[PDB]
Tab-separated table of N, CA and C and ligand atoms in Angstrom:
chain	number	residue	atom	x	y	z
N	1300	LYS	N	21.800	100.373	167.776
N	1300	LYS	CA	21.452	100.885	166.506
N	1300	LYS	C	22.399	101.898	165.931
N	1301	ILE	N	22.734	101.777	164.385
N	1301	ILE	CA	23.489	102.149	163.747
N	1301	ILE	C	22.713	103.608	162.965
N	1302	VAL	N	23.879	104.475	162.625
N	1302	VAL	CA	23.866	105.281	161.206
N	1302	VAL	C	23.960	104.818	160.005
N	1303	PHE	N	22.633	105.145	159.037
N	1303	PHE	CA	22.463	104.000	158.085
N	1303	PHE	C	21.571	105.813	157.295
N	1304	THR	N	21.731	106.555	156.298
N	1304	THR	CA	21.503	107.627	155.595
N	1304	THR	C	20.793	106.986	154.485
N	1305	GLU	N	19.521	108.000	154.260
N	1305	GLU	CA	18.676	107.536	153.027
N	1305	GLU	C	19.831	107.519	151.949
N	1306	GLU	N	20.689	107.941	151.311
N	1306	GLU	CA	21.562	108.230	150.670
N	1306	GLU	C	22.257	106.747	150.527
N	1307	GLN	N	22.653	106.452	151.597
N	1307	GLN	CA	23.128	104.586	151.910
N	1307	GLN	C	21.843	103.728	151.296
N	1308	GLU	N	20.795	103.949	152.171
N	1308	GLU	CA	19.662	102.785	151.319
N	1308	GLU	C	19.055	103.110	149.757
N	1309	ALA	N	19.543	104.123	149.718
N	1309	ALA	CA	18.971	104.487	148.015
N	1309	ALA	C	19.917	103.466	147.070
N	1310	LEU	N	21.562	104.019	147.569
N	1310	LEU	CA	22.263	103.020	146.701
N	1310	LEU	C	22.157	101.664	146.780
N	1311	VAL	N	21.822	100.892	147.987
N	1311	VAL	CA	21.102	99.439	147.976
N	1311	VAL	C	19.945	99.282	147.217
N	1312	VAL	N	18.991	100.258	146.896
N	1312	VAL	CA	17.053	100.133	146.695
N	1312	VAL	C	18.000	100.090	144.833
N	1313	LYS	N	18.520	101.222	145.209
N	1313	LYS	CA	18.614	101.467	143.651
N	1313	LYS	C	19.272	100.794	142.275
N	1314	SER	N	20.731	100.149	143.195
N	1314	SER	CA	21.348	99.375	142.566
N	1314	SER	C	20.380	97.658	142.360
N	1315	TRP	N	20.113	97.333	143.458
N	1315	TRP	CA	19.244	96.269	143.518
N	1315	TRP	C	18.334	96.254	141.968
N	1316	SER	N	17.065	97.160	142.184
N	1316	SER	CA	16.128	97.015	141.018
N	1316	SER	C	17.079	97.436	139.870
N	1317	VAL	N	18.067	97.913	139.274
N	1317	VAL	CA	18.678	97.276	138.154
N	1317	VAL	C	19.584	96.431	138.062
N	1318	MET	N	20.062	95.277	139.055
N	1318	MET	CA	20.174	94.209	139.037
N	1318	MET	C	18.921	93.009	139.221
N	1319	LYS	N	17.633	93.345	139.574
N	1319	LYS	CA	17.042	92.449	139.338
N	1319	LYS	C	15.962	92.017	138.323
N	1320	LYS	N	16.829	92.834	137.433
N	1320	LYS	CA	15.979	92.701	135.830
N	1320	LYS	C	17.044	91.207	135.728
N	1321	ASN	N	17.975	90.761	135.918
N	1321	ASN	CA	18.925	89.632	135.462
N	1321	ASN	C	18.915	88.918	136.770
N	1322	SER	N	18.153	88.431	137.527
N	1322	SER	CA	18.395	88.044	138.311
N	1322	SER	C	18.605	86.471	138.454
N	1323	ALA	N	18.113	86.425	138.000
N	1323	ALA	CA	18.150	85.091	137.628
N	1323	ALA	C	20.364	84.098	137.313
N	1324	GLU	N	20.332	85.273	136.112
N	1324	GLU	CA	21.981	85.145	136.065
N	1324	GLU	C	22.784	85.721	136.779
N	1325	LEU	N	22.213	86.518	138.065
N	1325	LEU	CA	23.151	86.547	139.209
N	1325	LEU	C	22.914	86.012	140.165
N	1326	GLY	N	21.941	85.320	140.558
N	1326	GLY	CA	21.872	84.320	141.531
N	1326	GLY	C	22.834	83.347	141.306
N	1327	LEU	N	23.057	82.675	139.964
N	1327	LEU	CA	23.844	81.459	139.143
N	1327	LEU	C	25.332	82.511	140.068
N	1328	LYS	N	25.813	83.019	138.843
N	1328	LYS	CA	27.079	83.844	139.293
N	1328	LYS	C	27.675	84.069	140.610
N	1329	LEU	N	26.396	84.742	141.755
N	1329	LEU	CA	26.868	84.137	143.236
N	1329	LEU	C	27.227	82.984	144.045
N	1330	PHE	N	26.843	81.848	143.055
N	1330	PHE	CA	27.092	80.905	143.585
N	1330	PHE	C	27.701	80.334	143.688
N	1331	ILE	N	28.100	80.338	142.113
N	1331	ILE	CA	29.096	79.678	140.918
N	1331	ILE	C	31.009	80.531	141.778
N	1332	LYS	N	30.540	81.458	142.056
N	1332	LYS	CA	31.408	82.511	143.110
N	1332	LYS	C	31.857	81.795	143.995
N	1333	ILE	N	30.506	81.668	144.889
N	1333	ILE	CA	31.292	80.852	146.284
N	1333	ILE	C	31.202	79.529	146.364
N	1334	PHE	N	30.939	78.381	145.345
N	1334	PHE	CA	31.385	77.215	145.303
N	1334	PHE	C	32.646	77.409	144.838
N	1335	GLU	N	33.112	78.398	144.003
N	1335	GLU	CA	34.693	78.053	143.575
N	1335	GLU	C	35.590	78.772	144.523
N	1336	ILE	N	35.204	79.633	145.880
N	1336	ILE	CA	36.164	80.204	146.164
N	1336	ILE	C	36.010	78.805	147.428
N	1337	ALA	N	34.863	78.189	148.236
N	1337	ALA	CA	34.843	77.270	148.788
N	1337	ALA	C	34.312	76.085	148.621
N	1338	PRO	N	34.540	75.128	147.409
N	1338	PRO	CA	33.455	74.334	147.096
N	1338	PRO	C	32.996	73.492	148.358
N	1339	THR	N	33.738	73.144	149.429
N	1339	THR	CA	32.887	72.351	150.636
N	1339	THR	C	31.112	72.722	150.604
N	1340	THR	N	31.123	74.034	149.973
N	1340	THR	CA	29.645	74.609	150.402
N	1340	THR	C	28.399	73.567	149.271
N	1341	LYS	N	29.435	73.182	148.442
N	1341	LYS	CA	28.592	72.246	147.315
N	1341	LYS	C	27.672	71.413	148.297
N	1342	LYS	N	28.634	70.575	149.402
N	1342	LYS	CA	27.643	69.331	149.735
N	1342	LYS	C	26.656	69.569	150.592
N	1343	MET	N	26.344	71.104	150.809
N	1343	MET	CA	25.274	71.701	151.593
N	1343	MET	C	23.896	71.596	150.119
N	1344	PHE	N	24.619	71.396	149.347
N	1344	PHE	CA	23.305	71.713	148.024
N	1344	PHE	C	23.296	70.611	146.989
N	1345	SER	N	23.816	69.485	147.843
N	1345	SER	CA	24.480	68.417	146.606
N	1345	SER	C	23.176	67.149	147.304
N	1346	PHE	N	22.232	67.158	147.893
N	1346	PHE	CA	21.227	66.522	147.954
N	1346	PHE	C	19.644	66.790	148.005
N	1347	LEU	N	19.163	66.410	146.682
N	1347	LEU	CA	17.894	66.805	146.788
N	1347	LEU	C	16.562	65.842	146.738
N	1348	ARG	N	15.669	66.142	147.334
N	1348	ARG	CA	14.978	65.267	147.532
N	1348	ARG	C	15.297	63.642	148.149
N	1349	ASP	N	16.236	63.267	149.067
N	1349	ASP	CA	16.463	62.288	149.933
N	1349	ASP	C	17.613	61.701	148.620
N	1350	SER	N	18.549	62.436	147.734
N	1350	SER	CA	19.097	61.420	146.618
N	1350	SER	C	20.223	62.629	146.619
N	1351	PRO	N	21.156	61.854	145.973
N	1351	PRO	CA	22.436	62.945	145.633
N	1351	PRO	C	22.111	63.701	143.777
N	1352	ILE	N	22.342	64.926	143.764
N	1352	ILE	CA	22.171	65.477	142.756
N	1352	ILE	C	23.433	66.710	142.970
N	1353	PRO	N	24.147	67.131	141.604
N	1353	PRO	CA	25.358	67.637	141.519
N	1353	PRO	C	24.646	69.243	141.901
N	1354	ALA	N	25.308	69.882	142.660
N	1354	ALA	CA	24.908	70.986	143.841
N	1354	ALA	C	24.746	72.090	142.700
N	1355	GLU	N	25.476	72.632	141.539
N	1355	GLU	CA	25.337	73.196	140.773
N	1355	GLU	C	23.693	73.156	139.975
N	1356	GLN	N	23.477	72.303	140.075
N	1356	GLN	CA	21.916	71.791	138.985
N	1356	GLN	C	20.466	71.609	140.530
N	1357	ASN	N	21.027	71.830	141.764
N	1357	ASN	CA	19.955	72.155	143.039
N	1357	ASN	C	18.636	73.285	142.199
N	1358	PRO	N	17.862	73.274	142.337
N	1358	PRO	CA	16.744	73.958	142.100
N	1358	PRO	C	16.810	75.126	143.494
N	1359	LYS	N	17.208	75.030	144.378
N	1359	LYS	CA	17.462	75.933	145.687
N	1359	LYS	C	18.306	77.186	145.729
N	1360	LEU	N	19.289	76.738	144.720
N	1360	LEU	CA	20.287	77.652	144.234
N	1360	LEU	C	19.782	79.200	143.882
N	1361	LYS	N	18.980	79.042	143.041
N	1361	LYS	CA	18.343	80.939	142.792
N	1361	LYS	C	17.508	81.414	143.297
N	1362	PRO	N	16.268	80.434	144.037
N	1362	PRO	CA	15.891	81.429	144.533
N	1362	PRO	C	16.497	81.734	145.837
N	1363	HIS	N	17.373	80.912	146.622
N	1363	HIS	CA	18.285	81.195	147.501
N	1363	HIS	C	19.054	82.523	147.347
N	1364	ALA	N	19.538	82.518	146.281
N	1364	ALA	CA	20.732	83.643	146.379
N	1364	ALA	C	19.838	85.360	146.146
N	1365	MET	N	18.671	84.952	145.284
N	1365	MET	CA	17.152	85.822	145.589
N	1365	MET	C	17.356	86.371	146.924
N	1366	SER	N	16.513	85.023	148.040
N	1366	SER	CA	16.501	85.838	149.273
N	1366	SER	C	17.683	86.737	149.778
N	1367	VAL	N	19.196	86.503	149.580
N	1367	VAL	CA	20.278	87.111	150.252
N	1367	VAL	C	20.118	88.619	149.662
N	1368	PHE	N	19.802	88.828	148.464
N	1368	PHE	CA	19.768	90.325	147.799
N	1368	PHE	C	18.466	90.705	148.352
N	1369	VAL	N	17.310	90.292	148.571
N	1369	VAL	CA	15.874	90.889	149.083
N	1369	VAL	C	16.001	91.408	150.513
N	1370	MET	N	16.819	90.109	151.051
N	1370	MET	CA	16.904	90.501	152.701
N	1370	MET	C	17.788	91.500	153.286
N	1371	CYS	N	18.772	91.813	151.772
N	1371	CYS	CA	19.971	92.276	152.672
N	1371	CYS	C	19.056	94.173	151.929
N	1372	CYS	N	18.450	94.008	150.519
N	1372	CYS	CA	17.798	95.365	150.649
N	1372	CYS	C	16.985	95.607	151.748
N	1373	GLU	N	15.594	94.761	152.072
N	1373	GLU	CA	14.637	94.877	153.181
N	1373	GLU	C	15.360	95.318	154.557
N	1374	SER	N	16.748	94.718	154.441
N	1374	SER	CA	17.765	95.023	156.144
N	1374	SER	C	18.552	96.697	155.324
N	1375	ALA	N	18.510	97.122	154.561
N	1375	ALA	CA	19.042	98.652	154.273
N	1375	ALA	C	17.888	99.298	154.770
N	1376	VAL	N	16.468	98.920	154.023
N	1376	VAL	CA	15.535	100.258	154.422
N	1376	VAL	C	15.041	100.213	156.069
N	1377	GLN	N	15.035	99.030	156.856
N	1377	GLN	CA	15.288	99.140	158.383
N	1377	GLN	C	16.118	99.609	159.046
N	1378	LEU	N	17.455	99.512	158.597
N	1378	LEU	CA	18.702	100.568	159.355
N	1378	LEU	C	18.223	101.901	158.798
N	1379	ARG	N	17.838	102.481	157.986
N	1379	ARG	CA	17.975	103.765	157.473
N	1379	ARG	C	16.918	103.932	158.631
N	1380	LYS	N	15.975	103.556	158.311
N	1380	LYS	CA	14.662	103.770	159.255
N	1380	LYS	C	14.739	103.753	160.588
N	1381	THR	N	14.793	102.549	161.231
N	1381	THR	CA	15.129	101.965	162.985
N	1381	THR	C	16.729	102.202	163.472
N	1382	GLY	N	17.676	102.332	162.874
N	1382	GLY	CA	18.986	102.475	163.159
N	1382	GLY	C	19.211	100.708	162.954
N	1383	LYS	N	18.125	99.478	163.090
N	1383	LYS	CA	18.132	98.166	162.801
N	1383	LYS	C	17.774	96.999	162.121
N	1384	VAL	N	18.211	95.842	162.176
N	1384	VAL	CA	17.272	95.007	161.437
N	1384	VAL	C	16.449	94.057	162.277
N	1385	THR	N	15.401	94.293	161.840
N	1385	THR	CA	14.584	93.496	162.929
N	1385	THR	C	13.579	92.264	161.740
N	1386	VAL	N	13.695	90.895	162.041
N	1386	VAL	CA	12.635	90.051	161.611
N	1386	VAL	C	12.323	89.775	162.175
N	1387	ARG	N	10.860	89.247	161.910
N	1387	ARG	CA	9.830	88.744	162.822
N	1387	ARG	C	10.792	87.423	163.412
N	1388	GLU	N	10.306	87.286	164.479
N	1388	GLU	CA	10.869	86.130	165.527
N	1388	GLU	C	10.610	85.036	164.932
N	1389	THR	N	9.672	84.624	164.714
N	1389	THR	CA	9.337	82.898	164.221
N	1389	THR	C	10.208	83.023	162.790
N	1390	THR	N	10.509	83.868	162.186
N	1390	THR	CA	11.124	83.609	160.845
N	1390	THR	C	12.751	83.387	160.627
N	1391	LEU	N	12.963	84.559	161.456
N	1391	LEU	CA	14.386	84.473	162.098
N	1391	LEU	C	15.172	83.380	162.933
N	1392	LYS	N	14.005	82.883	163.894
N	1392	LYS	CA	14.732	81.617	164.615
N	1392	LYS	C	14.465	80.729	163.450
N	1393	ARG	N	13.803	80.603	162.620
N	1393	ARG	CA	13.587	79.134	161.504
N	1393	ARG	C	14.778	79.452	160.526
N	1394	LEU	N	15.561	80.674	160.223
N	1394	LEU	CA	16.475	80.654	159.868
N	1394	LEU	C	17.971	80.323	160.463
N	1395	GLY	N	17.638	81.136	161.590
N	1395	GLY	CA	18.989	80.417	162.624
N	1395	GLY	C	18.815	78.676	162.263
N	1396	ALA	N	17.520	77.728	162.834
N	1396	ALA	CA	17.921	76.727	162.825
N	1396	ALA	C	18.022	75.967	161.709
N	1397	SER	N	17.048	76.418	159.998
N	1397	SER	CA	17.863	76.157	158.822
N	1397	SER	C	19.254	76.026	158.844
N	1398	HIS	N	19.873	76.980	158.851
N	1398	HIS	CA	21.585	77.251	158.526
N	1398	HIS	C	22.296	76.518	159.192
N	1399	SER	N	22.014	76.084	160.477
N	1399	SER	CA	22.891	75.865	162.000
N	1399	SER	C	22.515	74.204	161.422
N	1400	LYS	N	21.199	73.711	160.859
N	1400	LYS	CA	21.351	72.529	160.398
N	1400	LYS	C	21.548	72.218	159.741
N	1401	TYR	N	22.573	72.683	158.778
N	1401	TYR	CA	22.683	72.475	157.587
N	1401	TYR	C	24.714	72.807	157.577
N	1402	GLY	N	25.007	73.263	159.075
N	1402	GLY	CA	26.347	73.629	159.516
N	1402	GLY	C	27.237	74.641	158.832
N	1403	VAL	N	26.008	75.863	158.798
N	1403	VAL	CA	26.725	77.086	158.069
N	1403	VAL	C	27.677	77.809	159.267
N	1404	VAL	N	28.616	78.505	159.434
N	1404	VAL	CA	29.276	78.887	160.086
N	1404	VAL	C	30.120	80.286	159.522
N	1405	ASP	N	30.195	80.833	160.388
N	1405	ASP	CA	31.101	82.350	160.486
N	1405	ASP	C	31.640	82.501	158.628
N	1406	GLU	N	32.617	81.131	158.884
N	1406	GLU	CA	33.492	81.440	157.327
N	1406	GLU	C	32.655	81.535	155.998
N	1407	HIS	N	31.390	80.859	156.279
N	1407	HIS	CA	30.602	80.466	154.922
N	1407	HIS	C	29.846	81.398	154.665
N	1408	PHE	N	29.450	82.573	155.564
N	1408	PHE	CA	28.961	83.962	155.573
N	1408	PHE	C	30.082	85.068	155.513
N	1409	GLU	N	31.161	85.055	155.852
N	1409	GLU	CA	32.397	85.779	155.645
N	1409	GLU	C	32.472	85.574	153.769
N	1410	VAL	N	32.369	84.244	153.021
N	1410	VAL	CA	32.677	84.073	151.810
N	1410	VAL	C	31.665	84.369	150.944
N	1411	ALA	N	30.353	84.150	151.234
N	1411	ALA	CA	29.503	84.554	150.628
N	1411	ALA	C	29.695	86.109	150.399
N	1412	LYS	N	29.482	86.684	151.525
N	1412	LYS	CA	29.858	88.588	151.502
N	1412	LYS	C	30.515	89.056	150.483
N	1413	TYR	N	31.734	88.266	150.171
N	1413	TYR	CA	32.739	88.817	149.280
N	1413	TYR	C	32.770	88.359	147.687
N	1414	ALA	N	31.580	86.988	147.623
N	1414	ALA	CA	31.057	87.191	146.994
N	1414	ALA	C	29.702	88.013	146.559
N	1415	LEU	N	29.079	88.290	147.118
N	1415	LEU	CA	27.431	88.902	147.067
N	1415	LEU	C	28.828	90.488	146.707
N	1416	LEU	N	29.857	90.847	147.256
N	1416	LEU	CA	29.891	92.414	147.303
N	1416	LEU	C	30.877	92.394	145.432
N	1417	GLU	N	31.525	91.119	145.181
N	1417	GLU	CA	31.720	91.376	144.028
N	1417	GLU	C	31.080	91.061	142.830
N	1418	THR	N	29.818	90.333	142.668
N	1418	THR	CA	28.686	90.382	142.130
N	1418	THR	C	27.866	91.464	141.782
N	1419	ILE	N	28.172	92.419	142.782
N	1419	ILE	CA	27.810	93.974	142.769
N	1419	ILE	C	28.098	94.320	141.529
N	1420	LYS	N	30.078	94.539	142.412
N	1420	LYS	CA	30.710	95.293	142.002
N	1420	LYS	C	31.071	95.420	140.073
N	1421	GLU	N	30.549	93.910	139.611
N	1421	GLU	CA	30.326	93.483	138.777
N	1421	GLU	C	29.154	93.855	137.767
N	1422	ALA	N	28.038	93.251	138.476
N	1422	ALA	CA	26.573	93.624	137.934
N	1422	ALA	C	26.430	95.063	137.234
N	1423	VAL	N	26.900	96.392	138.372
N	1423	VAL	CA	26.868	97.174	138.029
N	1423	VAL	C	28.014	98.581	138.367
N	1424	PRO	N	28.905	98.020	137.182
N	1424	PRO	CA	30.378	98.877	137.397
N	1424	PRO	C	30.102	100.185	137.141
N	1425	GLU	N	29.411	101.099	136.191
N	1425	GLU	CA	29.367	102.446	136.547
N	1425	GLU	C	28.425	102.880	138.446
N	1426	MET	N	27.785	101.937	139.147
N	1426	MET	CA	27.164	102.646	139.789
N	1426	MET	C	28.445	102.397	141.248
N	1427	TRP	N	29.024	101.486	141.298
N	1427	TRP	CA	29.757	100.688	142.333
N	1427	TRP	C	30.708	101.716	142.687
N	1428	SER	N	31.359	101.805	144.290
N	1428	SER	CA	31.612	102.820	145.046
N	1428	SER	C	32.446	102.268	145.906
N	1429	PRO	N	33.459	102.813	146.987
N	1429	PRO	CA	33.392	102.705	148.111
N	1429	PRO	C	32.218	102.391	148.927
N	1430	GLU	N	31.358	103.987	149.180
N	1430	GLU	CA	29.634	103.750	149.579
N	1430	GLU	C	29.423	103.059	149.475
N	1431	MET	N	29.141	102.316	147.869
N	1431	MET	CA	28.202	101.403	147.789
N	1431	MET	C	28.483	100.405	148.383
N	1432	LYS	N	29.781	99.709	148.193
N	1432	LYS	CA	30.105	99.028	148.709
N	1432	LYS	C	30.007	98.609	150.500
N	1433	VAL	N	30.228	99.978	151.552
N	1433	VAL	CA	30.204	100.293	152.421
N	1433	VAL	C	28.459	99.867	153.143
N	1434	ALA	N	27.795	100.507	151.913
N	1434	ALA	CA	26.049	99.963	151.970
N	1434	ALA	C	25.286	98.962	152.046
N	1435	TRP	N	26.097	97.966	151.222
N	1435	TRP	CA	25.779	96.651	151.081
N	1435	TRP	C	26.141	95.906	151.738
N	1436	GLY	N	27.422	96.093	152.669
N	1436	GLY	CA	28.193	95.030	153.446
N	1436	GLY	C	27.669	95.301	154.919
N	1437	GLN	N	27.311	96.436	155.115
N	1437	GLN	CA	26.177	97.064	156.539
N	1437	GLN	C	24.942	96.375	156.714
N	1438	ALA	N	24.237	96.473	155.546
N	1438	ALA	CA	22.925	95.517	155.407
N	1438	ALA	C	23.369	94.211	155.799
N	1439	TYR	N	24.435	93.735	154.971
N	1439	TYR	CA	24.750	91.950	155.135
N	1439	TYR	C	24.836	91.689	156.588
N	1440	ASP	N	25.901	92.611	156.842
N	1440	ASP	CA	26.385	92.437	158.223
N	1440	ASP	C	24.900	92.352	159.756
N	1441	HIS	N	24.760	93.664	159.213
N	1441	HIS	CA	23.413	93.560	159.822
N	1441	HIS	C	22.395	92.024	160.173
N	1442	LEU	N	22.198	92.011	159.005
N	1442	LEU	CA	21.370	90.609	158.515
N	1442	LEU	C	21.662	89.463	159.130
N	1443	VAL	N	23.293	88.980	158.479
N	1443	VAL	CA	23.448	87.779	159.167
N	1443	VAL	C	24.077	87.888	160.645
N	1444	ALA	N	24.202	88.935	161.451
N	1444	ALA	CA	24.128	89.382	162.991
N	1444	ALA	C	23.214	88.560	163.536
N	1445	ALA	N	21.908	89.402	163.007
N	1445	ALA	CA	20.481	88.755	163.287
N	1445	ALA	C	20.231	87.175	163.609
N	1446	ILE	N	20.580	86.639	162.339
N	1446	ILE	CA	20.529	85.591	162.255
N	1446	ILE	C	21.569	84.386	162.762
N	1447	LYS	N	22.386	84.432	162.958
N	1447	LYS	CA	23.697	84.199	163.766
N	1447	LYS	C	23.318	84.614	165.162
N	1448	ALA	N	22.464	85.434	165.532
N	1448	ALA	CA	21.606	85.380	167.027
N	1448	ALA	C	21.012	84.396	167.628
N	1449	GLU	N	20.391	83.360	166.534
N	1449	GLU	CA	19.575	82.714	166.476
N	1449	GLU	C	20.119	81.581	166.218
N	1450	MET	N	21.069	81.196	166.203
N	1450	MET	CA	22.251	80.164	165.745
N	1450	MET	C	23.152	80.037	167.085
N	1451	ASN	N	23.574	80.907	167.898
N	1451	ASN	CA	24.083	80.882	168.773
N	1451	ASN	C	22.902	80.235	169.853
N	1452	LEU	N	21.970	81.184	170.109
N	1452	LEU	CA	20.946	80.817	170.858
N	1452	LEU	C	20.003	79.043	170.348
N	1453	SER	N	20.336	78.711	171.544
N	1453	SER	CA	19.702	77.178	171.121
N	1453	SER	C	19.358	76.505	169.428
A	164	LIG	C1	21.952	86.955	153.964
A	164	LIG	C2	22.818	85.816	154.440
A	164	LIG	C3	21.630	84.286	153.781
A	164	LIG	C4	20.261	84.957	153.833
A	164	LIG	C5	19.343	85.709	153.398
A	164	LIG	C6	19.919	83.617	153.582
A	164	LIG	C7	18.148	83.244	153.121
A	164	LIG	C8	18.180	81.447	153.508
A	164	LIG	C9	16.886	81.303	153.149
A	164	LIG	C10	15.468	82.154	153.272
A	164	LIG	C11	16.295	79.944	152.975
A	164	LIG	C12	15.612	79.126	153.206
A	164	LIG	C13	14.746	78.490	154.920
A	164	LIG	C14	13.960	77.463	155.363
A	164	LIG	O1	12.898	77.492	154.212
A	164	LIG	O2	13.924	77.486	156.613
A	164	LIG	C15	17.821	79.120	153.904
A	164	LIG	C16	18.228	77.913	153.652
A	164	LIG	C17	20.008	77.737	153.294
A	164	LIG	N1	20.340	78.005	153.357
A	164	LIG	FE1	20.567	80.857	153.217
A	164	LIG	N2	20.957	82.471	153.317
A	164	LIG	C18	22.132	83.302	154.059
A	164	LIG	C19	23.210	82.587	153.960
A	164	LIG	C20	23.927	81.347	153.729
A	164	LIG	C21	25.073	81.148	153.668
A	164	LIG	C22	26.240	81.711	153.463
A	164	LIG	C23	24.968	79.604	153.235
A	164	LIG	C24	26.101	79.179	152.991
A	164	LIG	C25	26.715	79.252	151.538
A	164	LIG	C26	23.701	79.011	153.213
A	164	LIG	C27	23.512	77.657	152.678
A	164	LIG	C28	21.622	77.540	153.552
A	164	LIG	C29	21.376	75.998	153.007
A	164	LIG	C30	22.024	75.192	153.106
A	164	LIG	C31	20.427	76.041	153.171
A	164	LIG	C32	18.963	75.236	153.278
A	164	LIG	C33	18.690	74.806	152.145
A	164	LIG	C34	17.826	73.807	152.189
A	164	LIG	O3	16.851	73.630	152.874
A	164	LIG	O4	17.545	72.775	150.847
A	164	LIG	N3	23.450	80.318	153.458
A	164	LIG	N4	18.511	80.709	153.666
């Protein structure tokens, strides 16, 4: 259980409500960053319907990137309310299984975090601050800690 004030929830929730308006562009930007920092991640998205696809063309990118934002936002709300992330067990186990199936490791989560933080920094420059950065980072960290615990565990 951590301290997470409603001020902190509000930074995440309010910035997301702004960014949500251009979420198509934003999700693309997120993956373009990740793909640049670590091109090996491209091959996690290089096959669609049992056939090669260039990873940037993959229709799962935008809903995937959307998921990252939405679930961090939900996690911010949960942290403030309960001091922890709680994802219904079955969905969490599935999230664990899905990521480990695709060979996602710590470094990928670290690269995505850095990329997520930079995309936010650039999407909402007049809301950006060290505390904004802490609030999204904390939400991401705890979400990923929960998913990881189902990647380690069987
Ligand atoms: C906050 C962290 C993350 C969240 C919330 C998230 C969200 C999701 C969701 C909802 C799915 C679909 C799960 C399913 O239907 O079983 C998924 C699958 C996937 N994710 Fe993530 N993800 C995260 C981090 C990452 C990272 C860092 C990578 C690698 C760069 C990654 C790569 C993948 C891959 C390869 C799949 C499988 C997609 C497919 O089935 O074609 N994820 N993720």
